[PDB]
Design a protein around this ligand. Structure first.
Ligand SMILES: Nc1ncnc2c1nc(N)n2[C@@H]1O[C@H](CO)[C@@H](O)[C@H]1O
Length: 377
């Protein structure tokens, strides 16, 4: 049968197929190549993807996301304790393991993380089946390089629940190296800088005669694009209060509409220098109309951009590497399109240029698809 490739990300998932000697990254039913990793349990309906994400605003306790943060971990791990305090849906202690609790038709229902991740995998599988017009039973699925045996096994178990045999788990850095087609011959040391919507990961990947090994990993589990948007929102919430004596945080619907326009404005400022953020009647009788420059966008976030170099220093130190030992810097995740990010990395690497695909959110799924093709021969 076919083997598909899935990037099971913290904030999103992406599915690729390898067919007629090319990788195709598939669109979801709404025409996007990225599906938000969200599942909602409201009014006796289950939704998966953007339709679930949209329920988060009015149904924050029934809308599950960021499950990758919980999968294969223990309820008392410091990281899960921190996540229970950040996440608005109920996380309960099932015999030492975090489980998700929600209501379906008012009934208390508990899920393992791998059961919610299975629902994201199910949807990616259905996109692949309808595209290939065949059943799909096998997949390459990616995980972070720092995932331990229980986190990898819990991801495999997610596959099994979704009716997917996970024939191979590969780390996200390896998947990126496969996508960018880094020469497998002789020896290459690669810094993989992966700045996503929710998380930052950096790995030293060494490629030696077609053998891939991650020598060191570090990161910041709570640093990504969504933080850069929150810094902009904070700024404009302050200004709108100053100007109109309206605190937009008093209206959940206003904050949702602002967040959407702020995300687009940030994307615009990776290409242009100045952009308009506009919402008619952000509340009744009050338009939101503001300009954001690249310079102000950077000023609002410069300490977070700069923070990304602390994990870079840690992996160089952990692997007893000097900046020079790094042969190529590869960038993954849409957040790496921010010019200032590219600039800061370059100057850290004493002038060296980094490589950024042009679909950096799809590189990991692309690599997983390539791995599927490699396995099929
Ligand atoms: N043009 C762009 N400039 C800055 N950030 C961008 C971006 N494109 C994406 N996807 N991103 C962000 O990447 C993350 C993963 O999708 C999200 O936080 C996007 O906003």
């Amino acid at each position: 049968g076919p083997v598909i490739g899935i990037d099971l990300g913290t904030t999103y998932s992406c599915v690729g197929v390898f067919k007629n000697g090319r990788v195709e990254i598939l669109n979801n039913e709404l025409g996007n190549r990225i599906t938000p990793s969200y599942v909602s349990f409201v009014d006796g309906e289950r939704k998966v993807g953007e339709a679930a994400k949209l329920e988060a605003t009015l149904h924050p306790t029934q809308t599950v996301f960021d499950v990758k943060r919980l999968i294969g971990r223990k309820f008392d791990d410091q990281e899960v304790v921190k996540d229970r305090s950040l996440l608005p849906y109920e996380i309960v202690n099932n015999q030492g393991k975090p489980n998700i609790k929600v209501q379906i038709k008012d009934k208390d229902t508990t899920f393992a993380p791998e059961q919610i991740s299975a629902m994201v995998l199910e949807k990616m599988k259905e996109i692949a089946q309808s595209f290939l017009g065949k059943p799909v039973k096998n997949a390459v699925v990616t995980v972070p390089a720092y995932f331990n045996d229980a986190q990898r096994q819990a991801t495999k178990d997610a596959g099994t629940i979704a009716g997917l045999n996970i024939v191979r788990i590969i780390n996200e850095p390896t998947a990126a190296a496969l996508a960018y087609g880094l020469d497998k011959k002789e020896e290459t040391s690669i810094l993989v800088y992966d700045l996503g919507g929710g998380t930052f990961d950096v790995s030293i990947l060494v490629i030696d005669n077609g053998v891939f090994e991650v020598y060191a990993t570090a990161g910041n589990t709570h640093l990504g694009g969504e933080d850069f948007d929150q810094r902009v929102m904070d700024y404009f919430i302050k200004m709108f209060k100053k100007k109109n004596n309206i605190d937009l945080r008093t209206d959940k619907r206003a904050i949702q509409k602002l967040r959407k326009e702020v995300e687009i404005a940030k994307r615009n400022l990776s290409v242009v220098h100045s952009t308009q953020i506009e919402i008619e009647d952000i509340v009744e009788g009050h338009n939101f109309s503001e300009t954001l420059t690249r310079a102000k966008f950077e000023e609002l976030n410069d300490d977070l951009f700069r923070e990304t170099l602390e994990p870079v220093k840690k992996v160089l130190d952990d692997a007893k590497y000097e900046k020079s030992k790094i042969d190529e810097i590869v960038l993954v995740g849409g957040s790496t399109r921010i010019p200032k990010i590219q600039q800061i990395i370059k100057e850290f690497f004493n002038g060296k240029e980094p490589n950024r695909g042009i679909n950096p959110d799809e590189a990991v799924a692309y690599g997983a698809a390539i791995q599927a093709g490699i396995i099929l021969g």
